[PDB]
Design a protein around this ligand. Sequence first.
Ligand SMILES: C[C@@H](N)[C@H]1CC[C@H](C(=O)Nc2ccncc2)CC1
Lengths: 341, 20
Amino acid sequence: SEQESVKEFLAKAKEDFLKKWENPAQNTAHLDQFERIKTLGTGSFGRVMLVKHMETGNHYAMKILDKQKVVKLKQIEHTLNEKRILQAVNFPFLVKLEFSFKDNSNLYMVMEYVPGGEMFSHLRRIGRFSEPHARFYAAQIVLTFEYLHSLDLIYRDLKPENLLIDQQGYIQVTDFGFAKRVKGRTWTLCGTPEYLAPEIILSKGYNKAVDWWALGVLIYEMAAGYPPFFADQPIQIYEKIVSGKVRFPSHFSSDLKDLLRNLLQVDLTKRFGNLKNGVNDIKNHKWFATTDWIAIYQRKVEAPFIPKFKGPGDTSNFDDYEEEEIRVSINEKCGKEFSEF
Amino acid sequence: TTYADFIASGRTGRRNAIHD
Ligand SMILES: C[C@@H](N)[C@H]1CC[C@H](C(=O)Nc2ccncc2)CC1
């Protein structure tokens, strides 16, 4: 009866998604409504900044993409995908998109500000998380992928850099730049090298099973403190991924090793998440025996770690970046390419 | 140790996505 309830919830969440998917919100704010405070992180197309909404006094995180840079890198369709998907989804562990708009130079997406910082920062500083701490995070991602995959979405860029910790110590998944809604197979070589499934590297055509492989890598990295395949050059990492060879640190519990062998399965027809029981093979695994899936979803479990928060607008959980001016050209750049944004 | 090998490696910082 637990399985049937999940199934009904997902049926309704699909209907809500589809109405927004088919009729996307557009142009819901303007730049001059926001005071820009500080840069929170960077990427190849622009940056994410802490901003304050002047009419309400609320703080947000604003993602800014340079249209000319997106075109140069051939990321037009990926950028249109990102916004279209993010405006339509609704889940406790996904960052909420509040406004989007564009001007002559840039695209803008304004999301809830998540003050606890990136999982990456905390993981590097502590070294590694204990198995129960790792388990708490992993559960949230399992439920998030169950939601996403039921909507025909593939996420494709799971890693600690993309996972933000909120005030309550729960995860928010951000950065939907490679997410795609797709019923069959897809072929784009994208993602982060340490996290890529072998079928992506081998140019085979691939599906949602790549997210389950990436979850294997994440769980290993959280519990070990380093990823299962690392080297100084990406080409060297690819060699290791396809080889089929994983070593586990001696402190891994036998249950965790077992989970991991089934997620890091080079053979698609043997990989947990891609068998007939689907996500249930993962949720029913021994390693997750103590996880109350409903309590996690409702956010009722006490988090193992809560970040220090010193009031609204505090950025102490984030690194410092050099600040750059936002230049807005007097001529419209790339109008046709981004007309649907 | 593997941990020491990792910490001395070129990839302990934030990792960029690939597009190409
Ligand atoms: C892929 C990485 N380069 C990218 C990870 C996401 C991050 C972000 O959205 N930060 C954020 C969002 C909302 N609230 C606080 C921080 C920006 C940089």
